[PDB]
Automatic annotation (TrEMBL):
<feature type="domain" description="J">
    <location>
        <begin position="4"/>
        <end position="70"/>
    </location>
</feature>
<protein>
    <submittedName>
        <fullName>Heat shock protein 40, type II</fullName>
    </submittedName>
</protein>
Length: 70
């Protein structure tokens, strides 16, 4: 299973959908492929960006979020 999605995004389990979006934008920008494409951090960032997008894709969906919380 995944490392916890909330912790990855730096949010608490009871945060709002807008909190999730703000955290996603901040962290996705940190690891954005357009920043890392010519650096040795390309691989690190690819993995982190992927996991950030996965965390947001689950937690931003009301039903998938409640299922994750079970």
């Amino acid at each position: 299973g995944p490392m916890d999605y909330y912790t990855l995004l730096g949010v608490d389990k009871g945060c709002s959908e807008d909190d999730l979006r703000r955290a996603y934008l901040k962290l996705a920008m940190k690891w954005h492929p357009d920043k890392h494409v010519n650096k040795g951090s390309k691989v690190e960032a690819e993995e982190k960006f992927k996991n950030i997008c996965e965390a947001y894709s689950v937690l931003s969906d009301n039903e998938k979020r409640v299922k994750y919380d079970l």
